[PDB]
Amino acid sequence: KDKLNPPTPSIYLENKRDAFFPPLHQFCTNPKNPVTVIRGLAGALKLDLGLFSTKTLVEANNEHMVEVRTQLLQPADENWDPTGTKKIWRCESNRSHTTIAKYAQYQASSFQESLREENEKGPFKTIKFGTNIDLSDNKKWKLQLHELTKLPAFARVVSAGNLLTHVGHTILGMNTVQLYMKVPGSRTPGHQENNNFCSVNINIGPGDCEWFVVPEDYWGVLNDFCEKNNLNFLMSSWWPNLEDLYEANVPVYRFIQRPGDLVWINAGTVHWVQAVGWCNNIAWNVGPLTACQYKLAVERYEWNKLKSVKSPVPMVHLSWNMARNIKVSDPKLFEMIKYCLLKILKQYQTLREALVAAGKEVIWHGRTNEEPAHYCSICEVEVFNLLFVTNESNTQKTYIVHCHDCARKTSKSLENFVVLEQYKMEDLIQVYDQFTLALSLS
Ligand SMILES: CCN(/C=C/N(C)C)C(=O)CNCc1cc(C(=O)O)ccn1
Ligand SMILES: [Fe+2]
Ligand SMILES: [Zn+2]
């Protein structure tokens, strides 16, 4: 049915007014729109995409690291086993590193070679995709990062309405810019964003990308398929067979992103992308202040625990920063945050009383401002407030963090550990008590 091939939510921008019009940010963050393509965005804002051209990038930081994916050049929207006899979900990708200068040479010679060839069931050729290029350093990428502050607030890397701004520290590639350098067939395989955060992607050009999108609420179907085909949904490289998805009554949005078009991926939307031509892309994440964003981020945070996968977003730390610093006026989002804080508080009280009842000392350790959230050095779970550190690491002042469970597993009565406390209970209770719903009339 055509309900399985829905139209792409699209906004067509002409000028700065259209870009700054409030209904645009509302349309993007509406859960009903799994993806929004904001066409003509760069043109409307007079954004200089030339600052992200391969020539410019080479001049700026020619030795900068590029992660290379070596992949097969597959036809159209398909993925075939290498023998070319059946379509399969697993895709072949080898990883290596290079520099912006070397990948640039390849990107150009790739184009020259296609010109020559034009003047003339696989097996398939190999291509290289330059991915995950880290544009976090403002000293190396001043002009590039400055250009992006011309976006409307809701889409910027940094803004008051962005939950990632409220984390209070860098999360690489989420609240810092990533760049991609591509040749035709460069594939970003199927995924959801880290902790289901929204994402922004702008195509620099000169060529096009083709996007495939499934709504968040079908992510389970794709997780199922993955397991049925011996794949880790979160961690393997897979490229959905569209025939399988259609048979499964999964709607698939598909569109072309042209140079200067911004793609807004909504919370939890499943997606995969390929370069149609030669192009670069830039991307980052944004966390709008909505009930839907927070709910989905919390859910994936908890799912990640079950799957033994680290959450790049420390949702406990973030939740406390929202309560300390953000007046929240949406009643549904308020109740979610308030609920989470209460769970955190009651688990922390239960653990801290257990320690005290067992006669284990709790050491006042405190905290530096802007100090990042801590994760367990063994299981990578976020650890809040009570840090378990070995006697030795404490002595050395390396303060290597374990969670309670990992510490107990090593050291049955915690005899090898000290317990460090970063926050007074009375102070957390106060932050919770004073976190109340603000009135907004809109
Ligand atoms: C799988 C989560 N992740 C980060 C992992 N890296 C930090 C390794 C992402 O960056 C997800 N977004 C990648 C992406 C890249 C493109 C692209 O190739 O343009 C389009 C859409 N999405
Ligand atoms: Fe993505
Ligand atoms: Zn642990």
- Shortest CA distance to 210 belongs to which of 174, 191, 184? 184
Q: Is 67 exposed, middle or buried (0-12, 13-18, 19+ CB in 10 A)?
A: middle
**Scanning the structure block, which residue is given the tokens 């007046």?**
327
Q: Which two tokens stand for residue 66?
A: 């590029």
The CATH number that applies at residue 376 is: 2.10.110.20
The closest residue, in CA terms, to atom 15 on ligand 1 is: 188
Residue 370, marked binder: no
- 246 plus 344 within the same structural domain: no
- 266 plus 374 within the same structural domain: no
Q: How many C-beta atoms lie closer than 10 Å to residue 79's C-beta? A: 23
- 184 plus 277 within the same structural domain: yes
- Among 289, 319, 346, residue at a domain's last position: 289
- 210 plus 167 within the same structural domain: yes
Residue 406, marked binder: yes
Tally helices (H) and strands (E) across the chain. Answer: 15, 18
- Index of the ligand 1 atom closest to the CA of residue 187: 18
- 126 plus 44 within the same structural domain: yes
Residue 191, marked binder: yes
* Rg from Cα positions in the chain: 24
- Shortest CA distance to 18 belongs to which of 44, 47, 46? 44
Q: Is 202 exposed, middle or buried (0-12, 13-18, 19+ CB in 10 A)?
A: buried
- 2 plus 137 within the same structural domain: yes
Please give the distance, rounded to the nearest whole angstrom, from the Cα atom of residue 28 to the centre of ligand 1. Answer: 19
Q: Which two tokens stand for residue 242?
A: 């569209």
What is the secondary structure of 257-319 as a DSSP string? E-TT-EEEEPTT-EEEEEESSSEEEEEEEE-BS-HHHHHHHHHHHHHHHHTT---SS-HHHHH
The closest residue, in CA terms, to atom 11 on ligand 1 is: 193
Q: Which residues line ligand 1 (CB under 6 A)?
A: 132, 173, 180, 188, 191, 193-194, 199, 201, 271, 273, 281, 283
Residue 209, marked binder: no
- 280 plus 232 within the same structural domain: yes
Contact 197, 399 (CB under 8 A): no
Query: Could you tell me what percentage of the chain is helix, strand and coil, using 3-state DSSP and rounding each to the nearest 5?
Result: 35, 25, 40
The closest residue, in CA terms, to atom 20 on ligand 1 is: 273
Taking the C-alpha atoms of residue 345 and residue 367, their distance in angstroms, rounded to an integer, is: 18
The CATH number that applies at residue 77 is: 2.60.120.650
Sign of CA dihedral 299, 303, 309, 314: positive
Which residues are in the CB-under-5-Å shell of ion ligand 3?
A: 376, 378-379, 403, 406
> What is the phi-psi region of residue 196: left when phi exceeds 0, alpha when psi lies from -120 to 50, beta otherwise?
left
- 31 plus 3 within the same structural domain: yes
- Index of the ligand 1 atom closest to the CA of residue 209: 19
- 435 plus 368 within the same structural domain: no
- Shortest CA distance to 171 belongs to which of 200, 198, 194? 194
Q: Domain count of the chain?
A: 3
What is the distance, to the nearest Å, from the Cα of residue 6 to the centroid of all Cα atoms in its chain? 25
Contact 171, 305 (CB under 8 A): no
Residue 340, marked binder: no
Taking the C-alpha atoms of residue 154 and residue 160, their distance in angstroms, rounded to an integer, is: 9
Q: Is 143 exposed, middle or buried (0-12, 13-18, 19+ CB in 10 A)?
A: exposed
Please give the distance, rounded to the nearest whole angstrom, from the Cα atom of residue 132 to the centre of ligand 1. Answer: 7
Sign of CA dihedral 287, 289, 290, 296: positive
Taking the C-alpha atoms of residue 304 and residue 375, their distance in angstroms, rounded to an integer, is: 13
Give the end-to-end CA distance of the chain in Å, rounded to a whole number: 39
Q: How many C-beta atoms lie closer than 10 Å to residue 190's C-beta? A: 23
Measured from the alpha carbon of residue 236, the closest ligand is 1
Residue 273, φ and ψ in degrees, nearest 5: -140, 145
Taking the C-alpha atoms of residue 297 and residue 330, their distance in angstroms, rounded to an integer, is: 17
Q: Which two tokens stand for residue 403?
A: 């969670």
Q: Collapse the DSSP code of 425 into the 3-class scheme (helix H, G, I; strand E, B; otherwise coil) and give the result.
A: helix
Alpha helices of 69-199 — where are they, by DSSP H?
100-118, 142-148, 163-166
For 24, the domain range is 1-289
Tell me: cis bond preceding 259? Omega within 30 of 0 counts.
no
Q: Which are the contacts of 38, defined by CB distance < 8 A and separation ≥ 6?
A: 10, 11, 13, 24, 28, 261, 262, 263, 264
- Shortest CA distance to 57 belongs to which of 109, 155, 156, 134? 134
Please give the distance, rounded to the nearest whole angstrom, from the Cα atom of residue 146 to the centre of ligand 3. Answer: 40
Residue 379, marked binder: yes
Which residue out of 103, 191, 255 has the highest number of ligand 1 atoms within 8 Å of its CB and is therefore the one to mutate? 191
Which residue out of 68, 201, 209 has the highest number of ligand 1 atoms within 8 Å of its CB and is therefore the one to mutate? 201
- 314 plus 434 within the same structural domain: yes
Q: Which are the contacts of 89, defined by CB distance < 8 A and separation ≥ 6?
A: 79, 225, 226, 229, 231, 238, 239, 240, 241, 244
Residue 226, marked binder: no
What Å distances lie between residue 19 and 83, 116, 317, CA to CA? Answer: 48, 41, 33
- Among 289, 309, 338, residue at a domain's last position: 289
Q: Collapse the DSSP code of 424 into the 3-class scheme (helix H, G, I; strand E, B; otherwise coil) and give the result.
A: coil
Angle formed at CA 38 by CA 33 and CA 43, multiple of 5 degrees: 175
Q: How many C-beta atoms lie closer than 10 Å to residue 261's C-beta? A: 24
Taking the C-alpha atoms of residue 133 and residue 100, their distance in angstroms, rounded to an integer, is: 9
DSSP state for residue 86 in the 8-state scheme? S
**Scanning the structure block, which residue is given the tokens 């992200």?**
52
Residue 134, φ and ψ in degrees, nearest 5: -90, 105
| Single-letter residue type at 285 | N
Taking the C-alpha atoms of residue 254 and residue 238, their distance in angstroms, rounded to an integer, is: 17
Alpha helices of 162-267 — where are they, by DSSP H?
163-166, 219-228, 242-247
What Å distances lie between residue 108 and 97, 105, 127, CA to CA? Answer: 18, 5, 13
Contact 322, 344 (CB under 8 A): no
Please give the distance, rounded to the nearest whole angstrom, from the Cα atom of residue 317 to the centre of ligand 2. Answer: 24
Taking the C-alpha atoms of residue 117 and residue 95, their distance in angstroms, rounded to an integer, is: 27
What is the distance, to the nearest Å, from the Cα of residue 260 to the centroid of all Cα atoms in its chain? 21
What Å distances lie between residue 252 and 39, 150, 200, 235, 261, CA to CA? Answer: 20, 32, 19, 22, 20
Q: Which are the contacts of 25, defined by CB distance < 8 A and separation ≥ 6?
A: 152, 153, 154, 155
DSSP state for residue 64 in the 8-state scheme? -
- 386 plus 419 within the same structural domain: yes
Q: How many CA atoms lie within 13 A of 250 on its CB side?
A: 27
- Shortest CA distance to 283 belongs to which of 93, 77, 129, 131? 131
Which residue out of 199, 262, 269, 278 has the highest number of ligand 1 atoms within 8 Å of its CB and is therefore the one to mutate? 199
Sign of CA dihedral 73, 74, 77, 79: negative
Measured from the alpha carbon of residue 387, the closest ligand is 3
Taking the C-alpha atoms of residue 201 and residue 282, their distance in angstroms, rounded to an integer, is: 6
Residue 168, φ and ψ in degrees, nearest 5: 90, 10
- 310 plus 386 within the same structural domain: no
- Index of the ligand 1 atom closest to the CA of residue 203: 19
Contact 395, 339 (CB under 8 A): no
Which residue out of 35, 188, 282 has the highest number of ligand 1 atoms within 8 Å of its CB and is therefore the one to mutate? 188
Please give the distance, rounded to the nearest whole angstrom, from the Cα atom of residue 405 to the centre of ligand 3. Answer: 6
Please give the distance, rounded to the nearest whole angstrom, from the Cα atom of residue 91 to the centre of ligand 2. Answer: 17
Task: State how beta strands 126-134 and 279-286 pair.
Answer: unpaired
Q: Is 410 exposed, middle or buried (0-12, 13-18, 19+ CB in 10 A)?
A: middle
The CATH number that applies at residue 441 is: 1.20.58.1370
